Enzyme design. Structure first.
Site, PDB file in Angstrom:
ATOM      1  N   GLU A  35      48.834 -52.250  -6.023  1.00  0.00           N
ATOM      2  CA  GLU A  35      48.619 -50.644  -6.080  1.00  0.00           C
ATOM      3  C   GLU A  35      48.936 -49.921  -4.882  1.00  0.00           C
ATOM      4  O   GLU A  35      49.628 -48.820  -5.075  1.00  0.00           O
ATOM      5  CB  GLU A  35      47.454 -50.660  -6.900  1.00  0.00           C
ATOM      6  CG  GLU A  35      47.233 -51.372  -8.404  1.00  0.00           C
ATOM      7  CD  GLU A  35      48.105 -50.581  -9.330  1.00  0.00           C
ATOM      8  OE1 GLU A  35      48.862 -49.529  -8.912  1.00  0.00           O
ATOM      9  OE2 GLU A  35      48.423 -51.142 -10.516  1.00  0.00           O
ATOM     10  N   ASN A  46      53.430 -39.572 -11.429  1.00  0.00           N
ATOM     11  CA  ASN A  46      53.999 -40.096 -12.644  1.00  0.00           C
ATOM     12  C   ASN A  46      55.228 -39.271 -13.209  1.00  0.00           C
ATOM     13  O   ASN A  46      54.884 -38.142 -13.224  1.00  0.00           O
ATOM     14  CB  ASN A  46      52.977 -40.834 -13.591  1.00  0.00           C
ATOM     15  CG  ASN A  46      51.881 -41.817 -13.064  1.00  0.00           C
ATOM     16  OD1 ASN A  46      52.547 -42.812 -12.476  1.00  0.00           O
ATOM     17  ND2 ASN A  46      50.766 -41.457 -13.149  1.00  0.00           N
ATOM     18  N   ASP A  48      55.063 -38.183 -16.513  1.00  0.00           N
ATOM     19  CA  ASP A  48      54.271 -37.565 -17.232  1.00  0.00           C
ATOM     20  C   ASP A  48      53.492 -36.119 -16.508  1.00  0.00           C
ATOM     21  O   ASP A  48      52.851 -35.466 -17.259  1.00  0.00           O
ATOM     22  CB  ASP A  48      53.324 -38.201 -18.021  1.00  0.00           C
ATOM     23  CG  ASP A  48      52.295 -39.015 -17.610  1.00  0.00           C
ATOM     24  OD1 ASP A  48      52.229 -38.625 -16.311  1.00  0.00           O
ATOM     25  OD2 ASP A  48      51.888 -39.993 -18.025  1.00  0.00           O
ATOM     26  N   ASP A  52      48.314 -40.806  -9.462  1.00  0.00           N
ATOM     27  CA  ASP A  52      47.672 -41.887  -9.322  1.00  0.00           C
ATOM     28  C   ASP A  52      46.855 -41.883  -7.780  1.00  0.00           C
ATOM     29  O   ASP A  52      47.810 -41.747  -6.854  1.00  0.00           O
ATOM     30  CB  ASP A  52      48.301 -43.146  -9.568  1.00  0.00           C
ATOM     31  CG  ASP A  52      48.628 -43.705 -10.934  1.00  0.00           C
ATOM     32  OD1 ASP A  52      48.539 -42.939 -11.653  1.00  0.00           O
ATOM     33  OD2 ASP A  52      49.490 -44.519 -11.176  1.00  0.00           O
TER      34      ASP A  52
END
Ligand SMILES: [Cl-]
Ligand SMILES: [Cl-]
Ligand code: NA
EC number: 3.2.1.17
Length: 129
Positions: A35, A46, A48, A52
């Site tokens: 990650e 992201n 949308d 993160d």
């Protein structure tokens, strides 16, 4: 801060993640590797418009507040910047909430695609824990 593999394993163990909800420590270290490459300051945007954050790439759409993800929930009740600290406590406490919500570690796409069903104990091999 960029953690070493065994350093992070030891920190996650001290924070209670070893076998939390049935996930051995190797799962958590593997997820953090893919990650964030063990970097507490990692951020990724992201499609949308959510972002993160941190070593476990916790999403601002649901879990923290960054003041720029409209209509987002703040279920860990923290500012997203708190997830970028060199102290992993906030990220770990939030991850405990995520992994308990029903889908387990499938919430972390990199875990699903790169750790799940692998020999995850290899990620804590050689560490003094
Ligand atoms: Cl393990
Ligand atoms: Cl992936
Ligand atoms: Na720490």
């Amino acid at each position: 801060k960029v953690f070493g593999r065994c350093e992070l394993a030891a920190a996650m163990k001290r924070h209670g993640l070893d076998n939390y909800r049935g996930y051995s420590l190797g799962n958590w270290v593997c997820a953090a590797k893919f990650e964030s490459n063990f970097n507490t300051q990692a951020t990724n945007r992201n499609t949308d418009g959510s972002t993160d954050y941190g070593i476990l790439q916790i999403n601002s759409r649901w879990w923290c507040n960054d003041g720029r993800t409209p209509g987002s929930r703040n279920l860990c009740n923290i500012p997203c910047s708190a997830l970028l600290s060199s102290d992993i406590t906030a990220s770990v406490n939030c991850a405990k909430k995520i992994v308990s919500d029903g889908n387990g570690m499938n919430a972390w796409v990199a875990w699903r695609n790169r750790c799940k069903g692998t020999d995850v104990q290899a990620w804590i091999r050689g560490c003094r824990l």
